[PDB]
Structures are given as C-alpha cells and as structure tokens.
Enzyme design. Structure first.
Site, short mmCIF file in Angstrom:
data_model
loop_
_atom_site.label_atom_id
_atom_site.label_comp_id
_atom_site.label_asym_id
_atom_site.label_seq_id
_atom_site.Cartn_x
_atom_site.Cartn_y
_atom_site.Cartn_z
N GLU A 35 36.77 40.40 29.80
CA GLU A 35 37.14 39.53 30.86
C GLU A 35 38.56 39.01 30.90
O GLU A 35 39.26 39.10 31.92
CB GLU A 35 36.33 38.19 30.85
N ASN A 46 41.42 37.80 43.03
CA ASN A 46 40.36 38.57 43.68
C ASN A 46 40.81 38.60 45.13
O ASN A 46 41.79 37.87 45.47
CB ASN A 46 38.98 37.95 43.43
N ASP A 48 39.25 38.07 48.90
CA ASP A 48 38.62 36.84 49.46
C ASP A 48 39.22 35.58 48.91
O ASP A 48 38.61 34.56 48.47
CB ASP A 48 37.09 37.00 49.30
N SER A 50 40.13 34.08 46.52
CA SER A 50 39.65 33.47 45.27
C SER A 50 40.39 34.10 44.03
O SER A 50 41.04 35.09 44.19
CB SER A 50 38.20 33.45 45.06
N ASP A 52 39.78 34.38 39.44
CA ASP A 52 39.11 34.24 38.14
C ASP A 52 40.10 33.65 37.10
O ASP A 52 41.11 34.27 36.84
CB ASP A 52 38.48 35.48 37.64
N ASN A 59 35.34 31.82 38.56
CA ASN A 59 35.81 31.83 39.95
C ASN A 59 35.87 30.49 40.68
O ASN A 59 34.96 29.72 40.69
CB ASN A 59 34.88 32.83 40.78
N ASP A 101 22.57 29.59 36.87
CA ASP A 101 22.47 29.70 38.29
C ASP A 101 21.66 30.82 38.91
O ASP A 101 22.02 31.18 40.06
CB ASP A 101 23.84 29.56 39.09
#
EC number: 3.2.1.17
Length: 129
Positions: A35, A46, A48, A50, A52, A59, A101
C-alpha cells in the site's frame, strides 16, 4: 518516514491490530507493505478527486478531510494530514472503522491483490516474539 517491517509490526501490534476482525498482524504488515511500502507519508491520488493517505493509504472520499474531495465526509473526523503522521495511532484507529464497515480488509486493494489468501504469517517472522 519509512517504517522497518518489524518496527511497523510492533507499532501495529501495540495498537491492537493483531487479529482485529479476525485479521492477523501479518495481514496488516502485508497490507502496509504493498500500500505505502511502509512510507508513513505515502499519499496517492485517485481519479474521482479523492486520495489515499498514509501507512494504510486511507481514502479522503470518506473517512478523513483533505478539503478538495468533492463528494466527501470524514467518517474518521480528521484532517488527511494527521493520517500522514510518523506515529500510526490515527491510521489504525481510522483503519479500524473501515475493516468494520462490512467488507473486511477488502477495502484495501493492494491487500486483496497482493495479500488475501497468502501465507501472511511470513510478514511477522524475525519480529520480536
């Protein structure tokens, strides 16, 4: 900052990620490795709008605030910057609500790729035990 495998492990273990939601520490060190490659300050844009952030590349489209994400909320109530710390404290705390989640560790793409269904215990070998 760059964590060493066994240092990251311990930090990790210390903040009780080991076996959290049934996912062994090795799972977590391994997710970290692919990661962020342990880079506490790993940030990845990313599309959209956004991004990380941090050890566990979390995110900002949800979970943390960076501002600039169009369709956002910070379910974790923090600035994405605090998730770029050299002390994991926050990342794991946030990381804890995301495993919880409804998906498990699938949330992390480099884990589901590179780690899920692997011999994840190899990541905690040599680590102080």
């Amino acid at each position: 900052k760059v964590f060493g495998r066994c240092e990251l492990a311990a930090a990790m273990k210390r903040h009780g990620l080991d076996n959290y939601r049934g996912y062994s520490l090795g799972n977590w060190v391994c997710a970290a490795k692919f990661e962020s490659n342990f880079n506490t300050q790993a940030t990845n844009r990313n599309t959209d709008g956004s991004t990380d952030y941090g050890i566990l590349q979390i995110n900002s489209r949800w979970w943390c605030n960076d501002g600039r994400t169009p369709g956002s909320r910070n379910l974790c109530n923090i600035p994405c910057s605090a998730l770029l710390s050299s002390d994991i404290t926050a990342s794991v705390n946030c990381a804890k609500k995301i495993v919880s989640d409804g998906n498990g560790m699938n949330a992390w793409v480099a884990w589901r790729n590179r780690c899920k269904g692997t011999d994840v215990q190899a990541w905690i070998r040599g680590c102080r035990l």
